[PDB]
Structure formats: structure tokens, C-alpha cells
């Protein structure tokens, strides 16, 4: 089991960490959502699906920088919604093919009433999402740590 990002980098068997840059809507008002869909960027596969089933959860989602201070949010993982930052590990998604399949995670972030001006700075760390992988074969229990960075400034009009 390993993962990669689109035109990007890879995290190999056994886990590790990688940096991911996302495009964000440049202007977002109170009451609106920034939607950050990682399922178009992060892809994973099972290396021996004929005998092994891989189980994959969102172990934890954490907010940083402008997102931590200026937004509240929710995360959608494989069809279900949760608070973001997260309050517990999600249920598991099964990976049973050598063909790349998206990691089905999306953040929905909305400005708090005190956000104004530049609420997220270009290039800044905005979130960490930890993918936890196990299987039905041995004791493997691995973390794939995705550091999520803003590509551009996000302004909350005042
Ligand atoms: O007849 C038994 C047999 C065994 N195999 C492959 C053995 C194997 C063992 C571990 C393994 O590890 C990687 O691949 C596994 C499947 O994705 C994953 O669960 C592991 O954690 C790890 O990333 C891959 C192949 N093929 N046939
Ligand atoms: Ni592989």
C-alpha cells in the first residue's frame, strides 16, 4: 500500500509524509464555504489485492495558521461528515485494487465573524491530514502524513 499526489510526489510502502498545495477561492464571505477537495490530488493503491485487504482511515485532521484562527470547518470522508479539526478517527475505507483510487477527503471551511482582510496567506500551512493504514494480513499499522499548504491568499471582505 502506498500513495501519491497528482503531478506531485509519493509516500512509499511503510508510510511517511508529504507536502500538498491546494488552490483556494481568492474571496470568501461569512456564510460561504471554501471547499478543499483532496480526492483529486491524493491517490492510493493496494499492492497485493488478491490476498490482502487494506483498511484506510482519516486518523486525524488538524488546522493551522489562518484556517485555525479564521475558519471553522467540517471534513467529509467517504460520504460522511465530521467536525474539522477532528474529534476521533473515522470508520475505514477498503482498498482492494492495484489501480489508483482517490483518498476521499474534502474540507469545508467557513470564515468566523472576526475574519477580515487576508485570512489565509499564500504559501502557508493550513492543515494536516493523517491517513492511517492497516490490513487483514499482518501487524502493519502505518501513517501517511499530508501537510496541506495554500497556493494563494484568501480574502474575507470587510
Ligand atoms: O501466497 C501469499 C502471497 C503473499 N504475497 C505478497 C506478500 C506481501 C506482504 C506484504 C506486503 O506489504 C505491502 O502491501 C500490502 C498490500 O497493499 C500492505 O497491506 C502492506 O502494509 C504493505 O504496504 C506486500 C506483499 N503474494 N502472495
Ligand atoms: Ni505499488
TrEMBL record:
GO biological process, one term: cell adhesion
GO CC, alphabetical: pilus
The FimH mannose-binding domain, residue ranges: 3-147
Gene from which the chain derives: fimH
Protein name: FimH
Disulfide bonds listed in the record: 3-44
Source species, domain of life: Bacteria
Residues of the full protein shown: 10 to 167 of 227
Species this chain originates from: Escherichia coli
